[PDB]
Amino acid sequence: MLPISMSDEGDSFLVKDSLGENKIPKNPSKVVILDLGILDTFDALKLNDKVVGVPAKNLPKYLQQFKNKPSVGGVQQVDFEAINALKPDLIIISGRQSKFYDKLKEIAPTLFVGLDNANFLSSFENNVLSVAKLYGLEKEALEKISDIKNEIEKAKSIVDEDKKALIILTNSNKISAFGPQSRFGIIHDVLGINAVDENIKVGTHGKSINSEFILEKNPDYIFVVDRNVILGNKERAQGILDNALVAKTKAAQNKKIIYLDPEYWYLASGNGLESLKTMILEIKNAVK
Ligand SMILES: O=C(NCCCC[C@H](NC(=O)c1cccc(O)c1O)C(=O)O)c1cccc(O)c1O
Numbered sequence: 001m002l003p004i005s006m007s008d009e010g011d012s013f014l015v016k017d018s019l020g021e022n023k024i025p026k027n028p029s030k031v032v033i034l035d036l037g038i039l040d041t042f043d044a045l046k047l048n049d050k051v052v053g054v055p056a057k058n059l060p061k062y063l064q065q066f067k068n069k070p071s072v073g074g075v076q077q078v079d080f081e082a083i084n085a086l087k088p089d090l091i092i093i094s095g096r097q098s099k100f101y102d103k104l105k106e107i108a109p110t111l112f113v114g115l116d117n118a119n120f121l122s123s124f125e126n127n128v129l130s131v132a133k134l135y136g137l138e139k140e141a142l143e144k145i146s147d148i149k150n151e152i153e154k155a156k157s158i159v160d161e162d163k164k165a166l167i168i169l170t171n172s173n174k175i176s177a178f179g180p181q182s183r184f185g186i187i188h189d190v191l192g193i194n195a196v197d198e199n200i201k202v203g204t205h206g207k208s209i210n211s212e213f214i215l216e217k218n219p220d221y222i223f224v225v226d227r228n229v230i231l232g233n234k235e236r237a238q239g240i241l242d243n244a245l246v247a248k249t250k251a252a253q254n255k256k257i258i259y260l261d262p263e264y265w266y267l268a269s270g271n272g273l274e275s276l277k278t279m280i281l282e283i284k285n286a287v288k
């Protein structure tokens, strides 16, 4: 994935990313943000007053300080009319809104801050730094990035080299599996937790598996992202995994089936200076 590149043009930057090119003014004061992790970053960089629109339909519990910003809909149900009515000077999007890119760029310059699943930390840093550059806050952003590296090192320090993990997403009653370099890859790729299968095929919403597969892998840890919650259905991962196949795995026997908070993992707030920290601690605390 091409990183964000930025050239200083006096009162604006000429900015290039994976989706195209924009002239972005310095210090934009009317920013519509559709990536929840970058919204968390605005908070951490003390830029809350710059924000004028947020996806209130998908606003997590840890981002309720933005509850009174004007809504621009949800991460998937982008309210174009609301965005146009706000007359923003910058729109910030990630992978869920690439399909809306031309429509959004005609309203205002549109910055892409997608996380590269093959290069998580590199893309995270480039996203946070590129926002911080717009406001002259590179120093503060560097010191926060450095804190996150220290959390990563504390986390990696307690990881048991000989235990193995399987990441699953549950949707309806269906299970799908994710591996290294996936949208949840940071468990394997950044935090160094080994995988039951390093060779799982990457593909947005996953690799279809069943409880037999889980038992055959016999993971020490099962990390579960229950997409039922973000979609709103009845069926819990805890119910689907209450079977005697899964019951025999080392993870079930050691109570190391971990239900990760989907508002972080699924909504993918890994761009957040505080929300990424939270995610690292959540893994550390489950495996220490
Ligand atoms: O382009 C994406 N999805 C388009 C198809 C989704 C259609 C539809 N999705 C949702 O209802 C949905 C709602 C909120 C957040 C989501 O990630 C959703 O997939 C479904 O239920 O299958 C996408 C991109 C990056 C990451 C994702 O999770 C995506 O869903």
Ligand SMILES: [Fe+3]
Pocket: none
């Ligand atoms: Fe999705």
